[PDB]
Amino acid sequence: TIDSARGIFPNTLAADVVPATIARFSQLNAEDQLALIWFASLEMGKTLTIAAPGAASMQLAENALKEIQAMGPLQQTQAMCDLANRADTPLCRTYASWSPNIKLGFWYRLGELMEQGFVAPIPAGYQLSANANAVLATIQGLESGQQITVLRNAVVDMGFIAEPVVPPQDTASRTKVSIEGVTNATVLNYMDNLNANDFDTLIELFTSDGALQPPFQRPIVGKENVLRFFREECQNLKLIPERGVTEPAEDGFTQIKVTGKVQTPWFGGNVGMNIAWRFLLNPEGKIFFVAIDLLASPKEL
Amino acid sequence: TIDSARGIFPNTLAADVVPATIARFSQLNAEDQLALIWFASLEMGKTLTIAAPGAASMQLAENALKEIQAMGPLQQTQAMCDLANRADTPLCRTYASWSPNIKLGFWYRLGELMEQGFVAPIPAGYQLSANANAVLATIQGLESGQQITVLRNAVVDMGFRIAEPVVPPQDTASRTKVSIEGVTNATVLNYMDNLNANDFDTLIELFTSDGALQPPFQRPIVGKENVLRFFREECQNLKLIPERGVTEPAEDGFTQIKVTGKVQTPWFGGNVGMNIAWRFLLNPEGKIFFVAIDLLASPKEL
Ligand SMILES: CC1=C(/C=C/C(C)=C/C=C/C(C)=C/C=C/C=C(C)/C=C/C=C(C)/C=C/C2=C(C)C(=O)CCC2(C)C)C(C)(C)CCC1
Ligand SMILES: CC1=C(/C=C/C(C)=C/C=C/C(C)=C/C=C/C=C(C)/C=C/C=C(C)/C=C/C2=C(C)C(=O)CCC2(C)C)C(C)(C)CCC1
């Protein structure tokens, strides 16, 4: 079973504080949510700078952005609350149709306009609720890797269409990773092809019924689904695995675990996220299941 | 706005450790989830015993319970994993159609059969994962009030509208009235009294047509039709025991009232007193536009 494979290398300690904090955040009042994120990014931006959104991304979020700017300050803040409350709204429906990167670039743009004053800002001297206060304190106590994940997910969870697929990296321009302990070809091809945005080659590593499980999400099942996931969300990452361990599995399978770091194009090398990959390969070396964990600490490798 | 009303009495500290812990639980392996609940249940049972499920409830879950028993051990544990993983399954679909009380009684009965051996039990000596172990430690460090809420919610979230029969409102002469230090408000007192009497028809009349009720850690349930369905499906045989409250003016001639006290669920009777806050937003005529029910972080929140 795919669902059973979810339990390989059960010693792996994932940072479940992330979804735990996201759950707390979700309980909050809409204006409190917006205020909290404002407060958090304002303080993170002091040391971490967000990569400017892509051109195609901006073009796609341009209509919604203009519409909000045309609104009066009241309607502006009301439309932001709608996004936050996951209200049924034309704006929220369009927002929901966006890929994570477009949603992110959408809010990236609102944040500038708010600081400039052209869009209704978080009220001045605004005070967070008792609960909201605690949630922000928890966030600020987190590793940057976990901080940005918490923010990314809170944004993706709002609302009620993706970027263009960049061409695979030129073959001669590609680099190969090395993993202490792991020479397995599937694992190595996985890493290399993903770093080269070669999703077409990547997907061929999977079994037809194979699954990929992103951090704190359910397994994405089937080649069609996994490939869409690659094309919509997994562009321009930098996988930097370090060590791995190789073990036999039931029915002639092989389970491999690799730990290392990953970089998002949104923050580049300024935020190195601690990641574990858990592979379950069939006898022919096909990926039946691969899980990506955000690790609790560097103490997880 | 209903969603804006969600922010009344903002300094009220709710036990968001509950949904946080539920979020951690959900990340877990299906088998680790079942084992964890088994472990927590087995330890809680030491000092807190669960009330037996209702007869009507049992009859309603009887078919599903039978089917699972007829299965071989392997298929039994697999069906249990389906529920946990929220797999798309005829069983899960039937489970999903049930009211929380029926789901709960369903599992109540499975647990007896497992302890008796008639249904495949949690593998002996089984070891929880790193993450699963932590989640159990957090649960065991919680107040019983928050422990049972965590378990209730984990169960309700399983599967992929069948409900118990509505009990008759308590005889009018037999009804008690609550008292609340500082609060003589008629709506508030009627709310408490009618609920304790299972008189939902009278109770629902206190709401504005577009009024909402927000259960702990849930979104506002909006509209008299929806709220009343909620009353009939989930809110029978509660015991509300408010203690004090504070009354304040609100925008547009409204009035916001906050009441703190305890609540008892028929599942545990007086063995678990939950710390609860009520936050009312009443319109000029005294209709409930919004009422939120919070599980409080600590007795220090009363
Ligand atoms: C909201 C809001 C505002 C704006 C907030 C902004 C602007 C926040 C921007 C946050 C961003 C920029 C977050 C970026 C997160 C990036 C992440 C978390 C990347 C993680 C990638 C991973 C870990 C991928 C791992 C993978 C691996 C390695 C595989 O092996 C397979 C594929 C895959 C699974 C993908 C303001 C302030 C105005 C206030 C009002 C409301
Ligand atoms: C799973 C599982 C198993 C069985 C587990 C079982 C059997 C667990 C049973 C637990 C139960 C029985 C918990 C019950 C909790 C009930 C609660 C938490 C009630 C709280 C009610 C409140 C707070 C309502 C407040 C209200 C107020 C006062 C209002 O003003 C308006 C209405 C409302 C909002 C309703 C075993 C072990 C075999 C292992 C395998 C898997």
Does B30 contact A87 at a Cβ distance shorter than 8 Å? Answer: no
A228 CA to middle of ligand 1, Å?
Answer: 18
Report how far ligand 2's centroid is from the alpha carbon of B22 (Å): 13
- A100 close contact with B: CB closer than 8 A: no
Measured between CB atoms, which of A13, A23, A87 is closest to B130?
Answer: A13
Q: Select from B127, B147, B144 the least CA-distant residue to B21.
A: B147
Nearest CA in chain A to B21: A20
- Residue showing tokens 């078919």: B63
For residue B216, what is the nearest residue in chain A, using CA coordinates? A27
- Give dist(CA A31, CA A253) in Å, integer: 50
The domain defined by A177-301 folds into: Nuclear Transport Factor 2; Chain: A, (3.10.450)
CB B285 within 8 A of CB B244: no
Q: Which residues contact A293 (CB under 8 A, 6 or more apart)?
A: A12, A14, A215, A275, A276, A277, A278
Other CB atoms within 10 Å distance of the CB of residue A119:
21
CB pair distance less than 8 Å for B87 and A19: no
> Which residues have C-beta within 8 Å of that of residue B122, sequence separation ≥ 6?
B34, B35, B38, B39, B114
A283 vs A257: CA distance, rounded Å: 17
Q: Which ligand is nearest to the CA of B102?
A: 2
A21: which chain B residues are within 8 Å (Cβ-Cβ)?
A: 20
Which residue of chain B is at minimal alpha-carbon distance from A29? B7
Give A177-180's long-range contacts (Cβ < 8 A, gap of 24+): A177/A239, A177/A240, A177/A241, A179/A241, A179/A242, A179/A243, A179/A244, A179/A258, A179/A260, A180/A242, A180/A243, A180/A244
Query: Are B255 and B282 spatial neighbours (Cβ–Cβ below 8 Å)?
Result: yes
- Experimental method for this entry? X-ray
R_g of chain A, CA atoms, integer Å:
20
- b or e along B193-212 (b: 16 or more beta carbons within 10 Å of the residue's beta carbon)? bbbbbbbbeebbebbbeebb
Atom of ligand 1 nearest to the CA of A107: 4
Nearest to B19 among A23, A30, A134 (CB): A23
Where are chain A's structural domains? 15-160, 177-301
Residue spans of alpha helices (H) in B143-293: 144-156, 186-196, 200-204, 224-234
Q: Is residue B255 helix, strand or coil?
A: strand
Residue A72: closest CA among A126, A124, A118: A118
H or E element in which residue A43 lies: helix A30-44
Are B7 and A27 inside 8 Å of each other by CB?
no
β-pairing verdict for B274-282 and B288-295:
antiparallel
CA of B187 to the centre of ligand 2 (A): 27
Q: How far apart are CA B127 and CA B252, in angstroms?
A: 58
Rounded (10°) angle between helices A17-27 and A144-156: 40
Residues A277, A259: Cα–Cα separation, whole Å = 6
How many Cβ atoms are within 10 Å of B186's Cβ, its own excluded?
10
B-proximal residues of A, 230-259, CB under 8 Å = none
Q: For residue B198, give how far its alpha carbon lies from the nearest alpha carbon of chain A (Å).
A: 29
CA pair distance B119, B111, nearest whole angstrom: 8
Helix (H, G, I), strand (E, B) or coil at B129: coil
Of the listed ligands, the closest to the CA of B237 is 2
A233 CA: nearest ligand 1 atom: 35
Which chain A residue has its CA at the smallest distance from B7's CA? A29
Query: Which residue minimizes the CA distance to atom 32 of ligand 2?
Result: B235
Question: Which residues of chain B come before a gap where C and the next N are over 2.5 Å apart?
Answer: 160
Domains A15-160 and A177-301 share a fold: no
DSSP per residue, A73-127: HHHHHHHHHHHHHT---HHHHHHHHS-HHHHHHHHHHHHHHHHHTSSPPS-TT--
Q: Where are the beta strands (DSSP E) in B82-214?
A: 207-214
CA distance B89 to B60: 18
Chain B residues within 8 A of A7 when measuring between CB atoms:
29-32, 129
Q: Exposed, middle or buried: residue A172 (CB in 10 Å: 0-12, 13-18, 19+)?
A: exposed
Q: Using a CB–CB cutoff of 8 Å, tell me whether B142 touches chain A.
A: no
Judge: domain B178-302, CATH 3.10.450.50: yes
The 3-state DSSP class for residue B14 equals strand
Ligand 1 pocket check for A41: Cβ under 6 Å: yes
Q: Which two tokens stand for residue A300?
A: 């997880």
DSSP H stretches of helix in A196-269: 199-203, 223-233
Instruction: Sort residue B144 into left (φ over 0), alpha (ψ -120 to 50) or beta.
Output: alpha
How near does any CA of chain A get to the CA of B165, in Å?
A: 32
Q: Measured between alpha carbons, how far is residue A75 from residues A70, A86, B96, B138 in Å?
A: 9, 16, 39, 42
Q: Give the number of the atom of ligand 1 that is nearest the alpha carbon of residue A191.
A: 30
List the one residue out of B109, B21, B31 whose CA is nearest residue B64.
Answer: B109
H or E element, residue B261: strand B255-264
Nearest-by-Cβ selection for A129 from B11, B134, B217: B11
For the domain covering A15-160, report its CATH number: 1.10.2090.10
Tell me, yes or no, if A224 comes closer than 8 A to chain B by beta carbon.
no
A148 CA from centroid of ligand 1 (Å): 6
Structure tokens that stand for A63 in this block: 């209509």
Query: Is the Cβ of A138 closer than 8 Å to some Cβ of chain B?
Result: no
CA distance to A128, A197, A288, B214, B230, per residue, from B258 (Å): 19, 56, 54, 14, 22
Looking up tokens 């544990």 gives B77
What distance in Å separates the CA atoms of residue B170 and residue B175, rounded to the nearest whole number? 7
Ligand 1 centroid, distance to A264 Cα (angstroms) = 8
**Which of the residues B34, B85, B290, B296 would you substitute to probe the A interface, choosing the one with the greatest number of A C-beta atoms within 10 Å?**
B85
CA angle B119, B123, B126 (to 5 degrees): 155
Whether A4 and chain B come into contact, CB under 8 Å, resolves to yes
Angle between helix A100-116 and helix A30-44 axes, rounded to 10 deg:
80
Given the structure tokens 């979230």, which residue do they identify?
B157
**Residue count (chain A):** 301
Could you tell me how many CB contacts below 8 A there are between chain A and chain B?
85
Residue whose CA lies nearest to ligand 2 atom number 34: B215
User: Among A17, A44, A237, A214, which residue's Cα sits nearest to residue A144?
Assistant: A44
Q: Are strands B207-214 and B221-222 parallel, antiparallel or unpaired?
A: antiparallel
Q: Which residue type sits at A99?
A: S
Q: Locate tokens 């958090």: which residue?
A: A40
The values of phi and psi at residue A275, to 5°, are: -125, 145
Residue A2 CB contacts under 8 Å (≥ 6 apart), including other chains: A209, A211, A219, A221, A288, A289
Tokens representing residue B197 in the block: 């009497």
The C-alpha atoms of residue B21 and residue A108 are separated, in whole angstroms, by 31
Q: Does ligand 1 come within 6 angstroms of the Cβ of A107?
A: yes
Q: Are A42 and B31 in contact (CB under 8 A)?
A: no
Tell how strand B274-282 and strand A273-281 pair up: unpaired
A7/B32 CB distance under 8 A: yes
What is the rounded (10 degree) CA torsion for A246, A219, A51, B23?
-110
> Pocket of ligand 2, candidates B18, B22, B31, B38: which has the most ligand atoms within 8 Å of its Cβ, to mutate?
B38
Give the count of alpha carbons within 13 A of A267, CB side only: 21
Grouping H, G, I as helix, E, B as strand and the rest as coil, residue B185 is: coil
Beta-carbon contacts of residue A116 (< 8 Å; ≥ 6 apart): none
CA A80 to chain centre: 22
d(CA B254, CA B282): 6
Q: Quote the CA–CA distance of A155 and A102 in Å, as a whole number.
A: 11
Spatial separation of the C-alpha atoms in residues B41 and B49, rounded to whole Å? 9
Hey, are the CB atoms on A13 and B81 less than 8 Å from each other?
no
* Count of helix runs (H) and strand runs (E) in chain B: 12, 6
CATH 3.60.15.10 is right for the domain spanning B15-161: no
C-beta A108 within 6 A of ligand 1? yes
**Beta-carbon count within 10 A of A161 CB:** 12
